[PDB]
Amino acid sequence: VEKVFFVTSPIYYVNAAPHIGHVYSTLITDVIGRYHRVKGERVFALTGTDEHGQKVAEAAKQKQVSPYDFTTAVAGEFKKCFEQMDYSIDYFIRTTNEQHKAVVKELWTKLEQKGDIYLGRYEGWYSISDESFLTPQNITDGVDKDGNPCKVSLESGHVVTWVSEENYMFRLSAFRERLLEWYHANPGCIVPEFRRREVIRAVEKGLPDLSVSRARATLHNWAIPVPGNPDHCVYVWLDALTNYLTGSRLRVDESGKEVSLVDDFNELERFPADVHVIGKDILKFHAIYWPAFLLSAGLPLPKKIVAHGWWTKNVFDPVEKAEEFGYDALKYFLLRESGFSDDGDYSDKNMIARLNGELADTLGNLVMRCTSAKINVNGEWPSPAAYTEEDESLIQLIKDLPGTADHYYLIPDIQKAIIAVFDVLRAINAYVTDMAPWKLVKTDPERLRTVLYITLEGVRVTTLLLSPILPRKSVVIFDMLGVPEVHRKGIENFEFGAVPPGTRLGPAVEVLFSKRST
Ligand code: MET
């Protein structure tokens, strides 16, 4: 089915200024979006801010300023951070937005009409910092920041409190079987697999009903009112999750402002999300609550939820590191250094180790070799002679790469996609070392044509598949190689030989990645 490829980040709480967690989550969203764009697909990538709730209102109170000002300020800081980080996100949604509120009311009303919301009580533990209902089995002993004996969340370690409120309740328990059906009929819908198994175990154990409203006093009146009952406010998570539906219905002008909210999601061909990028901290909300609401409303379910090993919500300022080491290089590091775990060091030592080893010595070095006036004397893509068996072994690696990288990108598993490309980059280097084209300029010009052509084509194809990771440096590489704009995109240009011999290199200047001291 030809739709617009719809990829989302989580919308982030605005109690705190943007930090690495949000930058990471949004980077993953950005890269997926970019890969589908290089593949020639229509893409709508979404990110934003989660502005309502007790948590934010209390953070505004601490800073001594109104919630409206506070959210607008911090939202602004987030907007600036993502511009600074050089993403290509199609739209930035805010839950304070009027059109968003409309969609929340629409969805609430649908759920109520369908018999799935009732008036009840929630009596139990609650983490305000996670905005999460917790059972007794998920709390434990700990300290508040006075240093006194309190209860804290097993999930997060944040301070929990007992809540006894009359609340609108969503009948989540009535959706246990349909959710389990969904997980089994769609075994790739939650990634990575061990997190998919975690969700399934939880839902197999049983589901309580979910409190979807809170009394307005408790939220400091900083939330969306329940339709037909202004004493209650909508649960910041139903509010929050609904951003995805809202985003799928907004028309956006060339400057990135929302101009129109369409009635039917099908008009824009975005809903449901093809990929939801989230941290492991919010898995239950996206894999249990969210599809249950969609099932109730008769709305389509997302295709994939990918949960990474970071708690999205000792300084590590990404804007600071990007200025020291390069923007693309930092993005490369974050995506290369860890797959689905915290485990993998985020040290200057290892950052330099990858910058030097992979970006400079593997990729950078190879680009200079195949473009230098020393080796490539005519400044062009030469026409190759006959291929040896060793030539063909390298060519096969280059030919097989796009299909392999495609699968990894679609999982999605961006670390594996990068490793797959660099495996081919390592191989190309080995080939160049073996063939020694610097010697071949004098000895065997006919052979050099073949060696150089293969190297150039390897560098192009690898660079194309790396262009979602290194969006700026890929443009620099393509300019040096002299690759016409039209060949920097599309599935057709994944194929070997797409740039013809005789193509002239771009003018010389420079380095791509400068090595750094240890
Ligand atoms: C609908 S995604 C909500 C994410 C949440 N605001 C967080 O910061 O974890």
Instruction: List Cβ neighbours of 370 (8 Å cut-off, separation of 6 or more).
Output: 376, 432, 452, 455, 456, 459, 481
Q: What's the 133 CA to ligand 1 centre distance in angstroms?
A: 15
Three-state secondary structure call for residue 13:
strand
* C-beta of residue 21 within 8 angstroms of C-beta of residue 318: no
Q: Which of 346, 374, 389 is the last residue of a domain?
A: 346
The domain that contains 255 carries what CATH number?
A: 3.40.50.620
252 bridge partner residues: 258
The domain that contains 130 carries what CATH number?
A: 2.170.220.10
Count, in order, helices (H) and strands (E) of the chain.
19, 17
Q: Say yes or no: CB of residue 50 within 6 Å of ligand 1.
A: yes
Q: Say yes or no: CB of residue 313 within 6 Å of ligand 1.
A: yes
Residues 439 and 503 in one domain: yes
211 bridge partner residues: 169
Q: CA of 349: how far to CAs of 72, 203, 325, 503, in Å?
A: 38, 43, 12, 40
Residues 387 and 498 in one domain: yes
Q: What's the 507 CA to ligand 1 centre distance in angstroms?
A: 47
CB atoms under 10 Å from CB of 289, counted, come to 22
Q: Say yes or no: CB of residue 471 within 6 Å of ligand 1.
A: no
Q: What's the 294 CA to ligand 1 centre distance in angstroms?
A: 18
Residues 280 and 256 in one domain: yes
Assigned token pair, 507: 């003018």
Residues 389 and 409 in one domain: yes
3-state secondary structure 187-242: CCCEECHHHHHHHHHHHHHCCCCEECEEECCCCCCCCCEECCEEEEEECHHHHHHC
Q: What's the 279 CA to ligand 1 centre distance in angstroms?
A: 9
Q: Say yes or no: CB of residue 10 within 6 Å of ligand 1.
A: yes
* Atom number in ligand 1 closest to CA 281: 9
Of 100, 94, 129, 101, nearest to 15 by C-alpha is: 129
Q: What's the 6 CA to ligand 1 centre distance in angstroms?
A: 18
Residues 111 and 122 in one domain: no
Residue indicated by tokens 């989660």? 50
- Mutation test residue for ligand 1: of 12, 52, 286, the one with most atoms within 8 Å of CB: 12
Q: Which of 236, 261, 281 is the last residue of a domain?
A: 236
Q: CA of 273: how far to CAs of 87, 196, 302, 412, in Å?
A: 19, 18, 5, 14
Q: Say yes or no: CB of residue 75 within 6 Å of ligand 1.
A: no
Residues 355 and 459 in one domain: yes
Q: CA of 441: how far to CAs of 293, 375, 427, 501, in Å?
A: 67, 7, 22, 18
Residues 173 and 203 in one domain: yes
DSSP-derived letter for residue 497 is: T
Three-state secondary structure call for residue 250:
strand
Assigned token pair, 268: 């824009």
* C-beta of residue 4 within 8 angstroms of C-beta of residue 271: no
- Mutation test residue for ligand 1: of 7, 8, 9, 11, the one with most atoms within 8 Å of CB: 11
Structural domains of the chain, count: 3
Instruction: List Cβ neighbours of 441 (8 Å cut-off, separation of 6 or more).
Output: 374, 375, 377, 448
- CA 66/CA 56 separation, integer angstroms: 11
* Atom number in ligand 1 closest to CA 242: 1
Q: Say yes or no: CB of residue 312 within 6 Å of ligand 1.
A: yes
* C-beta of residue 242 within 8 angstroms of C-beta of residue 274: no
413: left (phi over 0), alpha (psi -120 to 50) or beta: beta
Q: Say yes or no: CB of residue 18 within 6 Å of ligand 1.
A: no
Q: What's the 12 CA to ligand 1 centre distance in angstroms?
A: 5
Residues 508 and 390 in one domain: yes
* Atom number in ligand 1 closest to CA 282: 9
Q: Say yes or no: CB of residue 431 within 6 Å of ligand 1.
A: no
**Residue located nearest, by CA, to atom 2 of ligand 1:** 10
**Residue located nearest, by CA, to atom 7 of ligand 1:** 12
Residue indicated by tokens 């028309």? 251
Residue indicated by tokens 């939820």? 305
Residues 507 and 375 in one domain: yes
Q: Which of 346, 379, 403 is the last residue of a domain?
A: 346
Three-state secondary structure call for residue 159:
strand
Residue indicated by tokens 């950078």? 364
* C-beta of residue 233 within 8 angstroms of C-beta of residue 223: yes
* C-beta of residue 422 within 8 angstroms of C-beta of residue 459: no
Q: Say yes or no: CB of residue 130 within 6 Å of ligand 1.
A: no
* Atom number in ligand 1 closest to CA 278: 2
Q: What's the 187 CA to ligand 1 centre distance in angstroms?
A: 25
Three-state secondary structure call for residue 110:
helix
Of all residues in the chain, what percent are helix, strand and coil, respectively (each to 5)?
Answer: 50, 20, 30
Q: What's the 13 CA to ligand 1 centre distance in angstroms?
A: 6
The domain that contains 365 carries what CATH number?
A: 1.10.730.10
Q: What's the 183 CA to ligand 1 centre distance in angstroms?
A: 22
Q: Say yes or no: CB of residue 282 within 6 Å of ligand 1.
A: yes
CB atoms under 10 Å from CB of 98, counted, come to 8
- CA 23/CA 20 separation, integer angstroms: 5
Residues 168 and 229 in one domain: yes
Q: Which domain holds residue 186?
A: 116-236
Residues 361 and 458 in one domain: yes
Instruction: List Cβ neighbours of 377 (8 Å cut-off, separation of 6 or more).
Output: 441
- CA 466/CA 363 separation, integer angstroms: 11
* Atom number in ligand 1 closest to CA 50: 6
Residues 365 and 487 in one domain: yes
Instruction: List Cβ neighbours of 445 (8 Å cut-off, separation of 6 or more).
Output: none
* Atom number in ligand 1 closest to CA 12: 8
In this structure, the chain runs to a length of: 518
Q: What's the 113 CA to ligand 1 centre distance in angstroms?
A: 27
DSSP-derived letter for residue 355 is: I
**Residue located nearest, by CA, to atom 5 of ligand 1:** 12
- CA 294/CA 116 separation, integer angstroms: 11
Indicate if the alpha-carbon torsion angle 508, 510, 511, 512 is positive or negative. negative
Q: What's the 215 CA to ligand 1 centre distance in angstroms?
A: 21
